[PDB]
Amino acid sequence: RSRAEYVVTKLDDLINWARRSSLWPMTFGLACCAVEMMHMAAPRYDMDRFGVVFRASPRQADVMIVAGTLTNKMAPALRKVYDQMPEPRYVVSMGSCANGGGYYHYSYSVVRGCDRIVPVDIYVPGCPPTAEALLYGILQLQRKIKREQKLKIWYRR
Amino acid sequence: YPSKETAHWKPPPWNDVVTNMTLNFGPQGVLRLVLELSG
Amino acid sequence: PFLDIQKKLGISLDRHFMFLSAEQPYKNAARCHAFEKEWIECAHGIGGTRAKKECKIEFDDFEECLLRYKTMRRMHDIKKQREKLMKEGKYTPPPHHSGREEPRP
Amino acid sequence: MPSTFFNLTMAFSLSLLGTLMFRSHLMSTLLCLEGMVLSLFIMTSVTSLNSNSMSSMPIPITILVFAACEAAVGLALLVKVSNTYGTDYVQNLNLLQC
Amino acid sequence: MFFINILTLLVPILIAMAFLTLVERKILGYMQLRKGPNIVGPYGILQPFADAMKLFMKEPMRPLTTSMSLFIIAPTLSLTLALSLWVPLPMPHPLINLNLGILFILATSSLSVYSILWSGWASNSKYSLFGALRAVAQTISYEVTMAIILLSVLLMNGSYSLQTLITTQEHMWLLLPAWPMAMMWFISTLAETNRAPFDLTEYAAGPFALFFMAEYTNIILMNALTTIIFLGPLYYINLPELYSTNFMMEALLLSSTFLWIRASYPRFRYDQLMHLLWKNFLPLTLALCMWHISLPIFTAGVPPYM
Amino acid sequence: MWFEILPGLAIMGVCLVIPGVSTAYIHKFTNGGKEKRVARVQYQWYLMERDRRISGVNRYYVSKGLENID
Amino acid sequence: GRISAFLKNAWAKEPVLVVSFSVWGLAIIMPMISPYTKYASMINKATPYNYPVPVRDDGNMPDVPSHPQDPLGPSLDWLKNL
Amino acid sequence: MNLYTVIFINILLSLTLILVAFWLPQLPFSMKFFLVAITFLLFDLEIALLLPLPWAIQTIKTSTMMIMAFILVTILSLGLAYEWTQKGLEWTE
Amino acid sequence: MNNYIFVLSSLFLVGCLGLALKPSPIYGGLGLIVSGFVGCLMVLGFGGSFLGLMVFLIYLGGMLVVFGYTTAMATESNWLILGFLVLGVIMEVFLICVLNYYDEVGVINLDGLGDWLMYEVDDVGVMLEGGIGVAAMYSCATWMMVVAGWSLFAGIFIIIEITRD
């Protein structure tokens, strides 16, 4: 192909590498799944070693880890915090509650999945899914945002 | 001397004579705190 | 001053740094120390009116030292005349005023 | 030095005229007061350094300290005004006319 | 040649700042029985570069209600004050030899607390403004205790120069004559840098990266200043590389001491921090200030002007 | 293990060796194999200006000894 | 007795104020005790920041020396032996 | 000239950093804070008085300088003691 | 490099003009900080670094910190102040020009710019820097020393008494 598209592809590689190497989350943590989140933060799995910084503010956050049961009383707060997060933002839903309501699916005060409120990038299944599996979801997110070609789309505009 | 430009004045008194923080503690996150502070 | 407690008790709370020719740290003379000393030596003991009338020569010398108004007038006149002779071109600067001279310590 | 001293005196004059022409902000009035204070400090310091008056270089230090305590007093007064009226607007300060 | 010296001073300082972020991550991980970043790069050496590139690549969420003037001014001011703080430092020879370099340092810290105050007022939130006022009060109180401590130790030294400090330190460390002062100075530098246990903690992407850069640069500088003042490196007129290496080693130990303290201790309360300073340091600071006034008088050890 | 942090220690140690050593070397190179003469007082500045005037090349660091005296 | 107990339990509960006050008192009293206090003033007087202007002698004063390398004058052997 | 060059380079570097940072993505008053602010003003001006001591240590009249410095640091201590006794140092209703 | 001090004085005049023009008090304090830095630069250019670092360390260092702090506990646009500021700076340029041409060498001289900054300096000599006399306030002017100390002590008493409420 053209020489300019090669440079554009390499620039996409650099930008995607930066975004997946420096992935700062805030965990909108509610429950059991947030406990298992901090077990992934724990020294065995070491997302800080992976480049993923524990306890970041929503202003400095890249991905929101929806960890727990999203209730009707909490969904406006979830949407507000998601709106306060800057534009390059991803969503990792974790657990059956945040995925599709889970064990409280037929409840009067439980939102059937956080995808009804925020656009979810990756769903992590389990109740709770292990910290091993959540770290799998994070690495899958890094691969997914490695697959992005934003300057390639812009050049092909 | 009450004139039109000074008749609205009143004599001085003989003796010459709570706004608080309504903070919302929260996403440090499933806890809401309406917290009433004096400084 | 209005009250003379300092003169009555003989102390000098603030009288020893009144002017430039007063006491200085490590004997560092201020500018126009000699001129101000001459003015004070003239003006002492005769009062303000006779100091203004009679010590006008000393006061004018001290004021000229302190403000350099006539010095600025003279140097500006010299520079303006030199610039005019630059413009009409009948004069050239010497090597020592053009930055090319043999230095001396 | 005479041009810069003239500029400093015009700066003091502008700050004084700003002090004399009030706006809604007593904070702005105090800031103009310290514009005058700062201009006074520069004129005193340049005069002392030009005259080599080592005996009188403490005078800028004294004007700085004294004017700073005076402005601390004024800031305390502005705090009292802001507490009693919500704001520091000088038109709220007018019930001593009668 | 002077511009080359400027470049070879400032660029390695920024490299030291980025790798200070990396070594803080690694030391905190290894003190928490885990590892630092090592996947990003060979042994994590590309992790600060990835962090900086992501921070400059992410769009800054700029609220329109925030004043663009102050939003611009605060981080650029903080970074330029960190670098201006770095310039007048002799290692054992400075880029710029100032007559009153320590006064320059302290007043540059005053302009830094302007920077944090302006950022807090620009951040249009009442909680942000409250935390800003708390942080300015913290920085201000530890600045006044730094100024008095530093005044007394230079009363022992002789002048506000730093080569005079090197000549003072060429026989022994100032830590032995002024070690309680050294402890209070260390705590004061900690609370200036807002490190744990004095952190007591708004901006996204670009400004956040700039503030992070300036804060870590100030951390390295407080370590370097503590080294140069209190713990004199070995100085010889025929070789300055020994002084540079020894100052390097002591600065690395002091930076590791800040990371050590952050790992070890829980943070203070705001009332406890003000109580600690205004009721334990400043009485001791004033008493030791008058003691160090008295010391050369009754020992006849008045230092020279040069 | 704990020695894995020593890469970062080595990078920081190196990049604090460059500034001071480079500053001293640039001072020696710009002043002719000698330290940069400091003028903390007007006496030292006057000495620098005197050396600059004696040296005859408008650089103060060209010191002249007894070869200038018969 | 009671005063000694007051300083003792003050030192027990909080030594910061005790150390600061003792350092205050020591800073007051030690210039009045040490024999080196006058030597600081002597050294500051002996330090020659200014040129010593020579005096035109009429021969009526013999205390001033004609030469710097003379036994006459304020030598600093006390400073060398300090 | 050197310090002017370094400060200009510093400001230019910080300005270009904020410029590439932008171009690359394409009330209830509390009295006690004012109290510690003015206490800092007073103590900072007392520092401004205390600062010339590295040159005041070289004076001939060391006794008078020592007495003035002792009196000044004593009134620092007395003012701080006043504020401590009248509760200007605590954060309590 | 001879117009450096005049450029600094003009910048100080511009900052004082804006401060008199009275923007929102945060921006007024910013202009006062700029004017303080400029005054520091003028003092450093004219003489010893000590008085400049008093401006830069006590005036800038503490005093406008407390001004900014007290403004921060206060509260407040209309963008007119910039319009009168640019009008004031072009009027200032015109005024200094007409004063320069009209008074020949009086208060302002174009040819005399930079010629009369340092009048007379002791080229050979130690004990000339600006901190020496201010240190002699400890010895020569003990009355200065004690009135400044009593001013600060009384100011403490005054401030807690006023804010006692």
Ligand SMILES: CCCCCCCCCCCCCCCCCC(=O)OC[C@H](COP(=O)([O-])OCC[N+](C)(C)C)OC(=O)CCCCCCCCCCCCCCCCC
């Ligand atoms: C410069 C090189 C490096 C030095 C430091 C090395 C690293 C050390 C790191 C340690 C951990 C620090 C983490 C933060 C801790 C914060 C808490 C803290 O420190 O609080 C301070 C604590 C506070 O104590 P506190 O919290 O118990 O409060 C005291 C008040 N009461 C008890 C009423 C509640 O201590 C101090 O403030 C004391 C400071 C040191 C004073 C030392 C005085 C020694 C003697 C003086 C001289 C006497 C003789 C004079 C000459 C006589 C000659 C004859």
Ligand SMILES: CCCCCCCCCCCCCCCCCC(=O)OC[C@H](COP(=O)(O)OCCN)OC(=O)CCCCCCCCCCCCCCCCC
């Ligand atoms: C984003 C907006 C930010 C606004 C604030 C900017 C802050 C920048 C960082 C802090 C700079 C602090 C400078 C403080 C003044 C210098 C202090 C000092 O000690 O100066 C004296 C020194 C020489 O004195 P001495 O040591 O006695 O030497 C003689 C013996 N050989 O040296 C001198 O005499 C040199 C005199 C000049 C020194 C200062 C240079 C300032 C340069 C201009 C800055 C602004 C530029 C314009 C705006 C740009 C865009 C924002």
Ligand code: SF4
């Ligand atoms: S999915 Fe299961 S483990 Fe997770 S929050 Fe819901 S009930 Fe708890």
